[PDB]
Amino acid sequence: LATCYGPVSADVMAKAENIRLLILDVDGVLSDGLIYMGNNGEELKAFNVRDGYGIRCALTSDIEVAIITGRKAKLVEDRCATLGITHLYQGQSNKLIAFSDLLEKLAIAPENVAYVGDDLIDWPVMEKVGLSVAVADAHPLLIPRADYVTRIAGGRGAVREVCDLLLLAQGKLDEAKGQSI
Amino acid sequence: LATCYGPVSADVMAKAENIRLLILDVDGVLSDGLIYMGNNGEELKAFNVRDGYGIRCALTSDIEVAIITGRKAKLVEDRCATLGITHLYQGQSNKLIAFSDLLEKLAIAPENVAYVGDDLIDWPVMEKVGLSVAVADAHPLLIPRADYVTRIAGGRGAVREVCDLLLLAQGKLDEAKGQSI
Amino acid sequence: LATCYGPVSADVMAKAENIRLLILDVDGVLSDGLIYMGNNGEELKAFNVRDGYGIRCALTSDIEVAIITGRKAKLVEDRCATLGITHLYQGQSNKLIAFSDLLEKLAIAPENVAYVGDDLIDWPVMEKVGLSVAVADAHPLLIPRADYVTRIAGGRGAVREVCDLLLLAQGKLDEAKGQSI
Amino acid sequence: LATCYGPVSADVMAKAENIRLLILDVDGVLSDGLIYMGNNGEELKAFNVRDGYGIRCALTSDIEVAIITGRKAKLVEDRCATLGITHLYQGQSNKLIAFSDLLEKLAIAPENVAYVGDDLIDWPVMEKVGLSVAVADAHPLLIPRADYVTRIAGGRGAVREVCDLLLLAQGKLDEAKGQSI
Ligand SMILES: [Ca+2]
Ligand SMILES: [Ca+2]
Ligand SMILES: [Ca+2]
Ligand SMILES: [Ca+2]
Ligand SMILES: [Cl-]
Ligand SMILES: [Cl-]
Ligand SMILES: [Cl-]
Ligand SMILES: [Cl-]
């Protein structure tokens, strides 16, 4: 029950131990929620390298990683390519559609899935999964619903915190390896 | 009186109950006040997806949304397109003009209007509306003048907080649906 | 001695009363110190509209505004054009050179000048002026040398805070007009 | 043992006195860890001018500066050119390679090297050097391993803090000269 971010319940650790697939929202989870827009139609989004390391650890220690996001941008495809994420659903605000598709294709039971969200749109999927996670600065109405609330804010390493938790629960943390990219 | 951001007064809830139009400043309200400028004349501004969700909820819950801003940029037109906002006034440093235009165009009384601002230039309109709001980190001189002061800072979900308040006051918060974009 | 940011000394108010010229550093004063750089050689810098409003008030209330910075970028020329700043010195790491030119050009005594800095490179000039200001989050070694330390951090409205102070000290605050740009 | 960021140990100051080479990570040390990505494959990273000043002081006070990073970007080359850094290793998955090359090329012993990191990938090099530094907001598992934990966060002047410490320890702080760029 001890972790480098502080104590976790036995129940959260047991849920984390079973995790075969980690699903992430983007905006407000992998980022602090900001969308950068320019006069020539440019768009930027900011990701955190500390999360990149966690995702690389997950992917090289037998935990699959997927993304389901309401927005759609080529930059997100590029981020996934950097990190080796091969399951990406964009443009999807009815996330249960993507959820159903993903689990059918991978043959994974919902109880072996974790989901990290930050807003109410995430809840229908979070309700179904083995380990639901809200980031520290998630919408107030989402926070009390999740199995685990991260210590770290969205875009600041909430995703690394979840990666670290899964790895720890599975006895993979000490020997995990990643790239901080 | 209890909200997910903390208690509010009966007077504020009563004001919020009657709101048919939400008017928003941009810089310092929908953003944290920063203007990104480049050597080739590029310009960026950052918006928050959490505010996007609130605006989508409002617009699909019979609450119109308008924007009045002192600056002018194509990127702001683009953001409004994303969110389905059809009332945008840019390059406006006498805000009473756009305000009067909206009252006429939407056949609406000032008491049915809310305004979210962050600086002194917003007060002439805020003075007239049914629910005036200053964001948590508005200019110190503006804060004591508003009906309601948000808990959340400009660009970090102050607008969502206001959307949430209107929907709650109007008994629409539970069934409200949007896209976090 | 009261201000909207907190009490100030009689001595600081008296110094502020006499200011005919406001000199500002850029990086860490008008911004939070960040330089955005891209792979195509793009460069961005972020300014705060809250400071834009203060600068506009100063300029239209018989207080000249000048900028002395160690870096050089076209975007800074563009920012100055937005705000109507006509006294700009870039690529200047010996700031006394630019300081001397300014005083000579404008025929103004040092005691009638305020300077807002955030690092040790600003001290030679700050040492000579009537009102030296360090931003709240200036380098620790600079802070104790300044006449006034702002409550607000660089890039977050420290410059607005100084503009407000000068205008208050000179009985111009209530009637000052600017644009939030 | 007093510093402008607070007291340090006799041991840390003695280690700092012997430093002839300062090695820095980029993401999360020279920046706050964020990677900005756009739809046309643009990339931005943000550096802090306060760090630039410290690096300029180090380089002109007989302290070499090198950078070892896991990512690779032309913008980092450009940043190094601005600051006069001539020792840069990018795309480095095993940071010990660059470290060995540096000891070789510069004919310096590991006890005369400082290293500033923020994540677990930095530890293999940090383990070997004379002064290991973790930034204030480094990964929680790195923090207790370092000789010195900075007060300032990555991207906010943690590097400046380390530059100031080395200069102070070597009796070079008072007379050090730089450019805040
Ligand atoms: Ca989200
Ligand atoms: Ca504003
Ligand atoms: Ca500066
Ligand atoms: Ca790093
Ligand atoms: Cl979403
Ligand atoms: Cl405005
Ligand atoms: Cl400078
Ligand atoms: Cl790295």
UniProtKB/Swiss-Prot annotation, chains A, B, C, D:
> What is known about what this protein does?
Catalyzes the hydrolysis of 3-deoxy-D-manno-octulosonate 8-phosphate (KDO 8-P) to 3-deoxy-D-manno-octulosonate (KDO) and inorganic phosphate.
What InterPro entries does this protein map onto?
CMP-NeuNAc_synthase, HAD-like_sf, HAD_sf, KdsC_fam
Catalytic activity reads:
3-deoxy-alpha-D-manno-2-octulosonate-8-phosphate + H2O = 3-deoxy-alpha-D-manno-oct-2-ulosonate + phosphate
Which pathway, per its entry?
Carbohydrate biosynthesis; 3-deoxy-D-manno-octulosonate biosynthesis; 3-deoxy-D-manno-octulosonate from D-ribulose 5-phosphate: step 3/3; Bacterial outer membrane biogenesis; lipopolysaccharide biosynthesis
Protein keywords: Hydrolase, Lipopolysaccharide biosynthesis, Magnesium, Metal-binding
Output the SUPFAM superfamilies linked to this UniProt entry: HAD-like
Which residues are listed for Mg(2+) binding in this entry?
D25, D27, D118
Biological process terms from the Gene Ontology for this record are: lipopolysaccharide biosynthetic process
Q: Which GO terms describe its molecular function?
A: 3-deoxy-manno-octulosonate-8-phosphatase activity; metal ion binding; N-acylneuraminate cytidylyltransferase activity
Pfam families for the chain: Hydrolase_3
The name this protein carries in UniProt is 3-deoxy-D-manno-octulosonate 8-phosphate phosphatase KdsC
Family, as annotated: Belongs to the KdsC family.
> What EC numbers are recorded for this enzyme?
3.1.3.45
Required co-factor?
A: Mg(2+)
Q: Per its UniProt record, what Gene3D superfamilies does this chain match?
A: HAD superfamily/HAD-like (3.40.50.1000)
Chain sites annotated for binding substrate: D27, N48, V49, R50, D51, G52, R56, R71, R79, K95
